[PDB]
Structure 1
Amino acid sequence: ESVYGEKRISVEEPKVEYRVWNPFRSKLAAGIMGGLDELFIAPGKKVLYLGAASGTSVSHVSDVVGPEGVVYAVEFSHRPGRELISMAKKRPNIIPIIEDARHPQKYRMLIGMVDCVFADVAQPDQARIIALNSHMFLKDQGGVVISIKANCIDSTVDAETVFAREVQKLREERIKPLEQLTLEPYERDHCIVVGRYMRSGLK
């Protein structure tokens, strides 16, 4: 069975069903299909998603953390959230939150010590809505994968100024960006930003 209609392959060994990676549906999948150096998603560790509406992306994150790792989805909306509920009724890694992540301490007992966080939201306070997660839940030297939508955060200003402004907003919060990407032909005027939450040795 497909989760949203993508085509899955199957192999045999003395059956593995691999779900293909649509890059247009997910800016994380477009970030993999654009090419990355050092990806903070891991085959064993625990990872937190922000902005997991349904399993357009977060099911693939549950795959890439596998039978070991666990994915803490963060969302708010009722109708894609219910899809995430009973789509998490088959995979054990997935657990979603229905709380607004402007106060991530409202669900602070529900996760302890996440290591990696991903950002997919459209809110204009994207640095603050990640910084209220990574100041309390993120492991030291655990990285942040931002997904910046420049027309939704601040659309009056120029193109690169949004990313160059948010990167300094991250550098105010001990979030040194390792590397940047734009992923243009998959999605027009977007970005993903790989950094590591440093907190010790920022210069």
Structure 2
Amino acid sequence: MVEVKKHKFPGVYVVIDDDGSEKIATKNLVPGQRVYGERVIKWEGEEYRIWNPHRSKLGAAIVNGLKNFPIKPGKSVLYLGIASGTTASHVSDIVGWEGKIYGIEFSPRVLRELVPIVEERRNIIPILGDATKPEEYRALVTKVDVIFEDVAQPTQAKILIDNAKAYLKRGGYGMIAVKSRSIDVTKEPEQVFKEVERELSEYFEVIERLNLEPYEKDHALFVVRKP
């Protein structure tokens, strides 16, 4: 009745079921273990786990229509704003044993809960420190193909830019979840999104921009490339 299928993106999967609508899924990096109480399917020599889109915006953005997705099998990536890492579990599945994942968090106690889970998910490294200050973890990170930002502090444009000075390779990609209301609450979100576009386009090239409506409100996803 259920069927597991490939998505239009390398390493990303889809399930269809007893209602028959598409749900987003990943091929489990460590078969048998749970992370958040996910929906799962065991299969012909394999196991597949679902990402519920109401649990992280990046799932909802892929359902809405995000097309320029750069996180792919065997790539190297640095991510800021991970907490206990439900997001990180699904990019751990998509990237596999061939790649490299760093996850940086500023909230000190919520990162603690990921520490035993990475003893199985050994393609993730969890790191405690201020996402706005790259120098505070400089010895335990390397150059990467991709950066992702979803701390989405008031500083988040500097979080993305300064980590992309230090760690992003030439030709490499960036992603940012622009939390309009935490950068400036005094103006219409399209003015906030226009300053984020005009600051990022003085260092990166912008390749795609998405408002999360009609799924969620006043938050946006931007994706970019360094020359």
Q: TM-score, normalised by structure 1?
A: 0.90
Q: Structure 1: which 4+ aligned runs deviate by more than 3 Å?
A: none
Over residues 162-191 of structure 1, what are the superposed CA-to-partner deviations in whole Å (9 max), with x where a residue is unaligned? 11111111112x112111111223322211
Over residues 32-53 of structure 1, what are the superposed CA-to-partner deviations in whole Å (9 max), with x where a residue is unaligned? 1122222111101111111111
1:190 aligns with 2:222: no
Distance 1:104 1:43 in 2: 26
Q: TM-score, normalised by structure 2?
A: 0.81
Over residues 58-82 of structure 1, what are the superposed CA-to-partner deviations in whole Å (9 max), with x where a residue is unaligned? 1111111112112100102222101
2:16 — aligned with what? Answer: none
Q: Which residue identity lines up with residue 209 of structure 2 in the other structure?
A: Q
1:73 aligns with 2:103: yes
Query: Larger % of strand: which?
Result: 2
2:155 counterpart (125, 136, 144): 125
1:153 counterpart (163, 180, 183): 183
Pairwise CA RMSD: 1.4
Check the 8 A contact 2:68/2:208 in 1, yes or no: no
Q: Write the mapping of 1:13-52 to structure 2, written as runs, cut at 5 A.
A: 15-52=45-82
SS in 2 for 1:115: strand
Higher relative contact order (CA 8 A, sep 6+): 1
SS in 2 for 1:141: strand
1:4 aligns with 2:36: yes
Distance 2:60 2:99 in 1: 22
Distance 1:127 1:20 in 2: 31
Q: Write the mapping of 1:160-179 to structure 2, written as runs, cut at 5 A.
A: 160-172=190-202, 174-179=203-208
Distance 2:151 2:204 in 1: 18
Over residues 129-170 of structure 1, what are the superposed CA-to-partner deviations in whole Å (9 max), with x where a residue is unaligned? 111100011011111011111122212210211111111111
Percent of aligned positions with the same letter in both sequences?
Answer: 50
Distance 1:95 1:77 in 2: 16
Q: Write the mapping of 1:62-141 to structure 2, written as runs, cut at 5 A.
A: 62-141=92-171
In structure 1, the gaps of 5 or more residues are 199-203
Aligned residues: 195
Distance 1:74 1:37 in 2: 25
1:116 is displaced (CA, Å) by 0.3
Check the 8 A contact 1:40/1:142 in 2, yes or no: no
